[PDB]
Design a binder for this molecule. Structure first.
Ligand SMILES: [Zn+2]
Length: 467
């Protein structure tokens, strides 16, 4: 029971606390530093001793107490201390607009989920910002685009090859994630690099999201300009200080011509790594047979705009609509968002989260079981009376400190129970809710709140206008 486990690269020793075995800081790839910067993840060098896996590894460098370093490719494992073997495995992919976050953030501690559901929970870090979503393929074929996604895939491959040694079932892996993590999963469900790496998926407030191959190249060129590196000095991309990359990143990202509706960092179309839009691939059966639990919060947009924040600018406003819907649809939908704070908030909720989620769920419904939800809960009294983006996270993980009444603990039990039953069976039904399958004829949706309810074809008027 001292928890020494042999991974394919060497032994690691975790610890046991409050009924949960824990291993933190397990390397799953060679540190992507120096010559390995901007290249696909490689296997880490094997070690012959026993790694004290009781502390989180560094997180990927990002704008800001945890240590940061490009040497950040680590996974963490939480398993229940029970005689039960071959357990379902839930792999978490954190969000953060592709330039923020870490699998080791307190909110994602998997101890409670592991103990309550008797499942294994894996958290991980993947390259972010200029390290993981700066696509340099146009400059050197040796470089890979969508590095952050490749890292996630490598972590999933690590799970497939090593989780049995930790007591998990590599054939019952559920990948789940929120925001950028949900958008990442949208891509992983279709990407060549992630084929066969998981059997179920949960997409929270995030779906198909990509930038064009052309845009990726444009941004890449702008980055090198700021760095003062031309096409005959690419060697310097491997010796330049990480801080210089972070500096260039913030400079370009915060540029006046940049807005929240158009993510500066995000997956990019690329023949080698992500050939086409995830949604399109799914619509053609790329994720056949993979059950999908997907949803959004009712008031997503209120997290990005405050009562006294910037108010539109039809210029950049109409540009957002065309970018998110295409010129033809943008014109037909313009009517829904008359310039105003309210409209920009609704644009965020509807076009960055809701429409993508419904489009993805609809596409997948023709190839696998799909279950859709909308999270409505929030305190009644202002100023926190909105089902803000990410508000369901504390409930999913059972880590409620971020918010604790009995109703809060009750809602967390209801939500976490469904996530657990889904990981185990592919159906999120529990004693508290018989979850109806989502398909295009009825669009039955579960409404998560203190009291569970079901809405058939919710916001149908908005659906007809946006589709
Ligand atoms: Zn032992």
């Amino acid at each position: 029971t001292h928890q020494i486990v042999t991974t394919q690269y060497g032994k690691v020793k975790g610890t046991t606390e409050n009924g949960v075995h824990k291993w933190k800081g397990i390397p799953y790839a060679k540190p992507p530093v120096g010559q390995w910067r901007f290249k696909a993840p490689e296997p880490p060098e094997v070690w012959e001793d026993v790694l004290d896996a009781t502390a989180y590894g560094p997180i990927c460098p990002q704008p800001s107490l945890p240590r940061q370093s490009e040497d950040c490719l680590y996974v963490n494992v939480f398993a229940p201390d029970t005689p039960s073997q071959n357990l379902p495995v839930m792999v978490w992919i954190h969000g953060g607009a592709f330039y923020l976050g870490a699998g080791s953030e307190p909110l994602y501690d998997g101890s409670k989920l592991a103990a309550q559901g008797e499942v294994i929970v894996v958290t991980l870090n993947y390259r972010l910002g200029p390290f993981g979503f700066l696509h340099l393929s146009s400059f050197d074929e040796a470089y890979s685009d969508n590095l952050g996604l490749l890292d996630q895939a490598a972590a999933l491959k690590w799970v497939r090859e090593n989780i049995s040694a930790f007591g998990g079932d590599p054939d019952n892996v559920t990948v789940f994630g929120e925001s950028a993590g949900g958008m990442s999963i949208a891509a992983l469900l279709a990407m060549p690099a992630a084929k066969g790496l998981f059997q179920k998926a949960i997409m929270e407030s995030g779906a198909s999201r990509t930038m064009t191959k052309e845009q990726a190249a444009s941004t890449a060129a702008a980055f090198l300009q700021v760095l003062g590196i031309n096409e005959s000095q690419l060697d310097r991309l491997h010796t330049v200080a990480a801080e210089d990359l972070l500096k260039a990143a913030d400079q370009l990202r915060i540029a006046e011509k940049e807005n929240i509706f158009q993510l500066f960092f995000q997956p990019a179309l690329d023949p080698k790594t992500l050939p086409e839009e995830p949604e399109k691939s799914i619509a053609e059966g790329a994720a056949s047979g993979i059950p999908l639990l997907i949803g959004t919060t009712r008031d997503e947009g209120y997290l990005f705009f405050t009562p006294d924040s910037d108010v539109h600018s039809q210029e950049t406003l109409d540009a957002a609509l065309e970018y998110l819907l295409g010129k033809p649809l943008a014109e037909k939908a313009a009517d829904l968002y008359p310039r105003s704070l309210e409209s920009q908030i609704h644009m965020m909720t509807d076009l960055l989260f809701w429409r993508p989620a419904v489009a993805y769920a609809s596409a997948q419904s023709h190839y696998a079981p799909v279950w859709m939800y909308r999270f409505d809960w929030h305190p009644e009294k202002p100023p926190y009376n909105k089902a803000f983006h990410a508000l369901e996270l504390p409930f999913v993980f059972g880590n409620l400190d971020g918010l604790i009444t009995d109703e809060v603990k009750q809602l967390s039990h209801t939500i976490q129970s469904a996530w657990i039953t889904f990981a185990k069976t592919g159906n999120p039904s529990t004693e508290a809710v018989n979850w109806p399958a989502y398909h295009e004829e009825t669009r039955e949706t579960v409404i998560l709140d203190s009291e569970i309810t079901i809405e058939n074809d919710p916001e149908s008027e908005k659906r007809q206008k946006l589709f």
